[PDB]
Design an enzyme around this catalytic site. Structure first.
Site, PDB file in Angstrom:
ATOM      1  N   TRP A  36       0.844  -1.219   0.000  1.00  0.00           N
ATOM      2  CA  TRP A  36       0.000   0.000   0.000  1.00  0.00           C
ATOM      3  C   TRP A  36       0.863   1.246   0.000  1.00  0.00           C
ATOM      4  CZ3 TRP A  36      -5.116   0.907  -0.800  1.00  0.00           C
ATOM      5  CH2 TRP A  36      -5.961  -0.205  -0.828  1.00  0.00           C
ATOM      6  N   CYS A  37       0.459   2.193  -0.830  1.00  0.00           N
ATOM      7  CA  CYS A  37       0.972   3.577  -0.816  1.00  0.00           C
ATOM      8  C   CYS A  37       2.430   3.634  -1.246  1.00  0.00           C
ATOM      9  CB  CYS A  37       0.765   4.211   0.554  1.00  0.00           C
ATOM     10  SG  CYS A  37      -0.960   4.123   1.106  1.00  0.00           S
ATOM     11  N   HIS A  38       2.755   2.733  -2.156  1.00  0.00           N
ATOM     12  CA  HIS A  38       3.969   2.845  -2.960  1.00  0.00           C
ATOM     13  C   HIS A  38       3.741   2.056  -4.230  1.00  0.00           C
ATOM     14  CE1 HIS A  38       6.300  -0.967  -1.536  1.00  0.00           C
ATOM     15  NE2 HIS A  38       4.984  -1.184  -1.534  1.00  0.00           N
ATOM     16  N   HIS A 100       5.151  -7.798  -1.623  1.00  0.00           N
ATOM     17  CA  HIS A 100       5.841  -7.078  -0.538  1.00  0.00           C
ATOM     18  C   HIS A 100       4.836  -6.730   0.541  1.00  0.00           C
ATOM     19  CE1 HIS A 100       8.011  -4.271   1.869  1.00  0.00           C
ATOM     20  NE2 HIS A 100       7.128  -3.316   1.558  1.00  0.00           N
ATOM     21  N   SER A 101       5.133  -7.188   1.753  1.00  0.00           N
ATOM     22  CA  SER A 101       4.337  -6.888   2.950  1.00  0.00           C
ATOM     23  C   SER A 101       2.836  -7.085   2.667  1.00  0.00           C
ATOM     24  CB  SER A 101       4.656  -5.498   3.449  1.00  0.00           C
ATOM     25  OG  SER A 101       3.958  -5.212   4.655  1.00  0.00           O
ATOM     26  N   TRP A 160      10.647   0.175  10.144  1.00  0.00           N
ATOM     27  CA  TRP A 160      11.098  -0.479   8.900  1.00  0.00           C
ATOM     28  C   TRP A 160      12.600  -0.325   8.702  1.00  0.00           C
ATOM     29  CZ3 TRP A 160       6.652   1.907   5.447  1.00  0.00           C
ATOM     30  CH2 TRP A 160       5.446   1.293   5.793  1.00  0.00           C
ATOM     31  N   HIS A 251      12.998  -3.600   6.307  1.00  0.00           N
ATOM     32  CA  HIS A 251      11.711  -4.246   5.931  1.00  0.00           C
ATOM     33  C   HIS A 251      11.549  -4.351   4.421  1.00  0.00           C
ATOM     34  CE1 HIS A 251       7.368  -4.960   5.794  1.00  0.00           C
ATOM     35  NE2 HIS A 251       7.126  -3.725   5.347  1.00  0.00           N
TER      36      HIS A 251
HETATM   37 XE   LIG Z   1       0.975  -0.486   7.018  1.00  0.00          XE
END
Ligand SMILES: [Xe]
Length: 275
Positions: A36-38, A100-101, A160, A251
């Site tokens: 999210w948000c990248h 990723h994540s 991170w 991270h």
């Molecule tokens: Xe997050």
């Protein structure tokens, strides 16, 4: 530069940007999934490792890209539909998704919806396997708060980076995410909070797949033995689950140990190619 491979297409109602290196080679395609948000910029080093040998596709979500924008509310289910529509337009049949994540919510749902013929395996990178700890739970609440979201992001950046002066990761967080606002961060807080609430945990969600299949968790953080243990216990219980601790500083292994990320992705792609 990875902006050589940058495209844009209409996906239902929204114009989405995506990477596609359009490499003329044997499948599977490597589908790199941002959190999210990248955006695709997180993967510029990893793309470089894989570029010659694989077709590499990187979808950017609604409102995400070099020029972020406000969009109507959506979640991981919609991310799945967007990803599959991009693959359909490009004519891609077999793929290996790599997340990723919290792109992992998309990856696991994608495995379910696409099925094991199209998506035979998956790689999840640095994705919190347990339910939210107090600190993470607090971060989500701040992200949701119109008054405190930026404070929320700063707290996450501290975690991170884990006390490392990592040039490349700092550039990503402080420059490449700089344009993203409350519209994204608040949404990410709502979506992730709900994903944990409804699915329990990444491990629960994965175990509940209709057709279980090989998934590897490769991660650098958290660093503590207790985290390693939950991955080891899960791997003991489930033949299809494996993990690797990468020993990277942050991270973002896609940025700080891209060579290491790539060898795991290559191993899984080779396995797929051989039946
Ligand atoms: Xe997050």
């Amino acid at each position: 530069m990875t902006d050589t491979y940058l495209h844009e297409t209409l996906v239902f109602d929204n114009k989405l940007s995506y990477i596609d290196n359009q490499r003329d080679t044997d499948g599977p395609a490597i589908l790199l999934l941002p959190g999210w948000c990248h955006d695709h910029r997180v993967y510029k080093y990893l793309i470089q490792e894989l570029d010659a040998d694989f077709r590499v596709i990187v979808p950017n979500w609604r409102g995400h890209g070099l020029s972020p924008s406000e969009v109507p509310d959506f979640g991981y289910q919609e991310q799945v539909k967007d990803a599959l529509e991009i693959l359909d337009q490009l004519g891609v049949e077999t793929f290996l998704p790599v997340s990723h994540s919290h792109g992992g919510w998309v990856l696991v749902e994608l495995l379910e919806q696409a099925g094991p013929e199209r998506a035979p395996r998956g790689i999840i990178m640095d994705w919190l396997m347990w339910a939210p700890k107090p600190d993470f739970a607090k971060s989500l609440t701040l992200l949701k708060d119109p008054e405190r979201w930026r404070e929320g992001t700063h707290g996450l950046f501290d975690v991170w980076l884990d006390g490392h002066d990592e040039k490349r990761v700092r550039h990503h967080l402080l420059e490449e995410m700089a344009d993203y606002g409350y519209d994204c961060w608040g949404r990410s807080g709502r979506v992730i909070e709900d994903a944990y609430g409804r699915n329990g945990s990444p491990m629960q969600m994965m175990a509940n797949l209709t057709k279980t299949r090989p998934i590897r968790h490769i991660f650098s953080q958290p660093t503590e033995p207790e985290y390693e243990k939950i991955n080891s216990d899960f791997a003991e219980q489930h033949p299809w689950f494996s993990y690797a601790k990468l020993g990277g500083p942050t991270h973002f292994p896609a940025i700080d140990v891209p060579d290491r990320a790539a060898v795991h992705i290559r191993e899984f792609a080779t396995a797929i190619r051989q039946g």
